[PDB]
């Protein structure tokens, strides 16, 4: 019939539109931001803006992409990661003001233990293993101030290191790979993100160009 004949052309047009949309979305890297409670969730998105999930967009050197902030969500991790299966890059914004606060009334331990537990649950996961988790270090000035005023080994009796700015900023990286079991197909990237200058974004944006190729080589199978 005429309707059944025009349905073929309508299907062809809608499939062409869907393919165009998929090709446009296949060139946008999907970043998944998460962190602890009020761990610099708003100060990081207010940096590249001038130059309940949250949707943000910003283009750099002719590379447009979308970024998803988890926002405020009090739910379990068994049914929340199923929607986020296949994310290429998970940016964790660890807090540097959680090891000094006292133990919470509801939590069995302080906020730093909850942070490391969330990191362990988001890293030692059986669903996504080929993906990658990057770490962003925010609020470094106040962290250095509070670590020069108050010591850091008083709460961490595991080591006997000194109390400086470089040693403290360098020891927090090696303490994250000991909890990971699979290392041949998983990696963790850590970068320094200052809060005083805006020219640091391009210091980590190219870092994305380091990880994406990885999953691109995931299509190669030569690794």
């Amino acid at each position: 019939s005429a309707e059944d004949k025009a349905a073929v052309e309508r299907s062809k047009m809608i499939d062409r539109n869907l393919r165009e949309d998929g090709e446009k979305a296949a060139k946008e890297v999907k970043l998944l931001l998460l962190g602890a409670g009020e761990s610099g969730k708003n100060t990081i998105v207010k940096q590249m803006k001038i130059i309940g999930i949250v949707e943000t967009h910003f283009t750099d050197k002719d590379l447009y992409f979308k970024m998803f902030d988890v926002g405020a969500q009090r739910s379990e991790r068994k049914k929340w990661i199923h929607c986020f299966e296949g994310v290429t890059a998970i940016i964790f914004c660890v807090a540097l003001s959680d090891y000094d606060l006292v133990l919470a009334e509801d939590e069995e331990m302080n906020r730093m233990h909850a942070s490391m537990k969330l990191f362990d649950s988001i890293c030692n996961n059986k669903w996504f293993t080929e993906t990658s988790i990057i770490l962003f270090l925010n609020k470094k000035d106040l962290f250095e101030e509070k670590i020069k005023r108050s010591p850091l080994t008083i709460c961490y009796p595991e080591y006997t290191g000194s109390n400086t700015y470089e040693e403290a900023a360098a020891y927090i990286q090696c303490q994250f790979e000991d909890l990971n079991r699979r290392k041949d197909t998983k990696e963790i990237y850590t970068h320094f993100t200052c809060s005083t200058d805006t020219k640091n974004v391009q210091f980590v944006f190219d870092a994305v160009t380091d990880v994406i190729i990885k999953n691109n080589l995931k299509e190669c199978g030569l690794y």
């Binding site: 949250v54 009090r74 739910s75």
Partner: protein, 234 residues
């Protein structure tokens, strides 16, 4: 049911309602549903005016497009709910959260009438019997059971020894004689009513099945997996 309205979920608490039959336009929006704190899991249309949503903060309340606000609120589960199930008579709906229990909820008064427990682990999806005397429930404990509303207990249990995974979705037949339950082994299993025998064995799924749909006539059953393959079985 009338094919006039359609609504999608979302993790950002944006339950945008859409319609098909529109003048000078294909698909447009008129009202915006908002006010939820937890993530939306599933949505069911009670009728052409009143709809019900399943959020991730133990608020499986009913909503309306005209007023844009919820009418009644359902609460009483210790954990958040992730599945819903309507009834053919359009009078009540059963809801089961991750507390390994399912509760019935009335649309008129809006409160739990009966609680059923007995699952070893949390559940994923629930289905209702076409007649309305009982309802089946699948969980991750590799077990199936149908709680009776009059007997206030389950009739039979569907155990499994060689199955370590769970059930992601459960559904009935046209009248409720045949049982359908999708497992995590990239397939589905068809169970009997009382014999508890795997009469039908499914296969062909490249990825994990998410949810399956059975028509009202019970002729064919469509299944939905993560491999973007909507295969219909008959």
């Amino acid at each position: 049911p009338s094919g006039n309205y359609v609504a999608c979920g979302g993790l950002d608490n944006i339950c945008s309602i859409y319609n098909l039959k529109t003048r000078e336009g294909n698909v447009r929006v008129s009202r915006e549903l908002a006010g939820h704190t937890g993530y939306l899991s599933c949505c069911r249309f009670l009728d052409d005016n009143q709809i019900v949503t399943s959020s991730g903060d133990t608020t499986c309340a009913l909503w309306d497009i005209e007023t844009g606000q919820q009418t009644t609120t359902f609460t009483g589960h210790t954990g958040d709910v992730m599945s819903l199930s309507l009834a053919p008579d359009t009078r009540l709906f059963v809801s089961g959260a991750c507390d390994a229990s399912a509760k019935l909820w009335d649309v008129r008064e809006g409160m739990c009438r009966q609680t059923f427990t007995g699952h070893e682990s949390d559940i994923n999806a629930i289905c209702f019997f076409p007649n309305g005397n009982a309802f089946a429930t699948g969980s991750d404990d590799a077990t199936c059971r149908l709680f009776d509303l009059r007997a206030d207990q389950e009739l039979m249990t569907y155990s499994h020894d060689n199955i370590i995974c769970g059930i992601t979705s459960v559904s009935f037949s046209k009248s409720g004689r045949l049982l359908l339950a999708g497992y995590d082994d990239f397939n589905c299993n068809v169970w009997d009513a009382l014999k508890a025998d795997r009469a039908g064995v499914l296969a062909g799924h490249d990825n994990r099945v998410s949810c399956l749909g059975v028509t009202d006539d019970g002729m064919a059953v469509a299944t939905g997996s993560w491999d973007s393959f909507l295969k219909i079985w008959n």
